[PDB]
């Protein structure tokens, strides 16, 4: 269906100890393909997917220089933002940046985004029109006025609607055997008696891609969310994801409860029932 | 590929 490329940047100040720790990661849909770590020995952007290995050395030179320039800007931002909020010079703070582009099932441009955070809270972000900004507080209005006067959104819009979409299409073509694949979830259910009258029915979903999935429990065909425990979708470590949903049912009525699995890789919605 | 160097806040 739809696809997306996203880049994540994190900078954490170490006051007095030296330069900020900097980690950058790139993803196409749910797959990481590049990384940079300021504490690594290579000091270079590194591959993380087999299909990005096709790029020549000039690719990795340009990507390394650009990602290091990101960390330089964040280093100055950490000093600037400390002054905006009248914070001590000894406290450790965090800057986070995320941007990328979405495309539809026909690989045409769908939307772009570019968001910025300080200490885990929204600071400033580009609007869907890719022409104006959303300032989260009064300190970020100063940045908004600075970025509006410099027409920063015009440069970002050229990347998001252009370069971002063009290389996302290139990545989907070079890695079509893994990016354009759909791994259907392999499902199963477990049963464990809680007490003499209760039982736990856990609905499992393993080794699926992409990560988007839905697990719902029904009592007699009607959705139930009373005693339904649901954990976050987790990575398996091999490019696929895992997820389970559990419910505590009265012992002897397990044949009424049903688990419904919805995933892009399933031609039909799966229905699970404990006998 | 990444975007180019961003403008400081």
């Amino acid at each position, epitope marked *: 269906g739809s696809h997306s490329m996203r880049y994540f940047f994190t900078s954490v100040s170490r006051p007095g100890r030296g330069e900020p720790r900097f980690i950058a990661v790139g993803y196409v849909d749910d797959t990481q393909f590049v990384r940079f770590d300021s504490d690594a020995a290579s000091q270079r952007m590194e591959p993380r997917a087999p299909w990005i290995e096709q790029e020549g050395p000039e690719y990795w030179d*340009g990507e390394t220089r*650009k990602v290091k320039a990101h960390s*330089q800007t964040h*280093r*100055v931002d950490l000093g600037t933002l400390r002054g905006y909020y009248n914070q001590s010079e000894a406290g450790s703070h965090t800057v986070q940046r995320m941007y990328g582009c979405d495309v539809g099932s026909d690989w045409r441009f769908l939307r772009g985004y570019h968001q910025y955070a300080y200490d885990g809270k929204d600071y400033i972000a580009l609007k869907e029109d890719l022409r104006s900004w959303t300032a989260a507080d009064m300190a970020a209005q100063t940045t908004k006025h600075k970025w509006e006067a410099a027409h920063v959104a015009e*440069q970002l819009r050229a990347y998001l609607e*252009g370069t971002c979409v063009e290389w996302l299409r290139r990545y989907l073509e070079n890695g079509k055997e893994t990016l354009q694949r759909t791994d259907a979830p392999k499902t199963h259910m477990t049963h464990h008696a809680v007490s003499d009258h209760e039982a736990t029915l856990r609905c499992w979903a393993l080794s699926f891609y992409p990560a988007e999935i839905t697990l719902t429990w029904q009592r007699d065909g009607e959705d139930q969310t009373q005693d339904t425990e649901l954990v976050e979708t987790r990575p398996a470590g091999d490019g696929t994801f895992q997820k389970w949903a559990a419910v505590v049912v009265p012992s002897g009525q397990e044949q009424r409860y049903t688990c419904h699995v919805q995933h892009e890789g399933l031609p039909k919605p799966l229905t699970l029932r404990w006998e | 590929i990444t975007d*180019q*160097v961003p403008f400081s806040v």
Partner: T-cell receptor
Amino acid sequence: QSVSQHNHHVILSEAASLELGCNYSYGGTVNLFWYVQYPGQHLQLLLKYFSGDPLVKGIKGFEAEFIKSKFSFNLRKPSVQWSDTAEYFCAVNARRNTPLVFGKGTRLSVIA
Amino acid sequence: GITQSPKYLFRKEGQNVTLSCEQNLNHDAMYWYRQDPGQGLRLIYYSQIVNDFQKGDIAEGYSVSREKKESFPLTVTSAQKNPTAFYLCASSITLSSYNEQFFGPGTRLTVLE
């Protein structure tokens, strides 16, 4: 990474056609610029390729053609005026967090 | 805009001079050039953001510092032995290709014995 402007001095009569060549050695995506320095004035941007139409029209009747396949950004003007007598600089940026690279420049002399 | 050292200035053989360059355009990137006749603009030093500078093509014999956003002073040491030279300062929003450079008026530096 270099930018080549072939002719270093061009002499033209008024109302004649102008054609200043520019080529670059970088092989990736680029942004391209033309700067003009009139005698006794500061260097200023004449036109630039941001994105879109390869035929980029500028001020004072100037036009540049971005030929991506031939790595050229030739500057043209159908009828030079006497006030066009200046030095013209081609410039190309490589989007690799590297500084903008200028050509050696072409001095334009327009016979009054 | 950009304001730099006076259009003309001279030095003595054995003396160092500092050429100033200031901009209130809130730009991150600043540049120093030497305009040689026949070679065009030659990059001496450039600074993409405060506290960060990198050598150009002819950085030999020169020295810079970027302690404030507004200022990018260029110092010409005595090891630089050109009898006359024309220096140009420039700034841009960022080092990004989408940002053109804005140039100062220029400064001719001669050696007056």
